[PDB]
Write a protein that binds this DNA or RNA. Structure first.
Length: 184
DNA sequence: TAGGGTTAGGG
């Protein structure tokens, strides 16, 4: 396949105890050709860890699978998520289900239309907030964007580069005030 | 509900 394996792969959380490679495949093959399908197990006990991965031949097929939520596998509602790489999985909050992104390093003259013209393609935007110092009114160089669907956030943050108001910016899942403090 | 013997040499 032309597109990277990491972007063709979904984490499937909350599997029934009973789900196997074969039953997971039988379900998710409805939305495309699977190049990989695995239920993770504890080595010695071989018991399911309750999650697995499915990988499609194309990202378009991944998108079709996410568009078909909610998914019931072997009688249990499961939780498919964009697969976060092992490296990125080390970061605080990498696996949270959130609807808001932090957008860091935006120019002083960035306005909401700049953020819409990059982010609307990923999903329905509910809130845009370009952050200022409350007292001085000075722009602080970051914004928060809130979407309607956590998968919009997940599709965004697995990518490396994001161009807003002409220049790259860094985009991460939003951590709460207390989550920021616990990550320090 | 976050990865499968899948992450820093030897010059």
């Amino acid at each position: 396949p032309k597109e990277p394996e990491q972007l063709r792969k979904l984490f499937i959380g909350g599997l029934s105890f009973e789900t196997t490679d074969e039953s997971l495949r039988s379900h998710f093959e409805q939305w495309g050709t699977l190049t990989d399908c695995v239920v993770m197990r504890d080595p010695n006990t071989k018991r399911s860890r309750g999650f697995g991965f499915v990988t499609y031949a194309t990202v378009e097929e991944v998108d079709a699978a996410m568009n078909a939520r909610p998914h019931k596998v072997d009688g249990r509602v499961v939780e498919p998520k964009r697969a976060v790489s092992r490296e990125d999985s080390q970061r605080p909050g990498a696996h949270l289900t959130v609807k808001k992104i932090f957008v860091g390093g935006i120019k002083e003259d960035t306005e909401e239309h700049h953020l819409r013209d990059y982010f609307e393609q990923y999903g329905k935007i509910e809130v845009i907030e370009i952050m200022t110092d409350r007292g001085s009114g000075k722009k602080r160089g970051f914004a928060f964007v809130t979407f309607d669907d956590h998968d919009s956030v997940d599709k965004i943050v697995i990518q490396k580069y994001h161009t807003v108001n002409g220049h790259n910016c860094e985009v991460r899942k939003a951590l709460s005030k207390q989550e920021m403090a616990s990550a320090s």
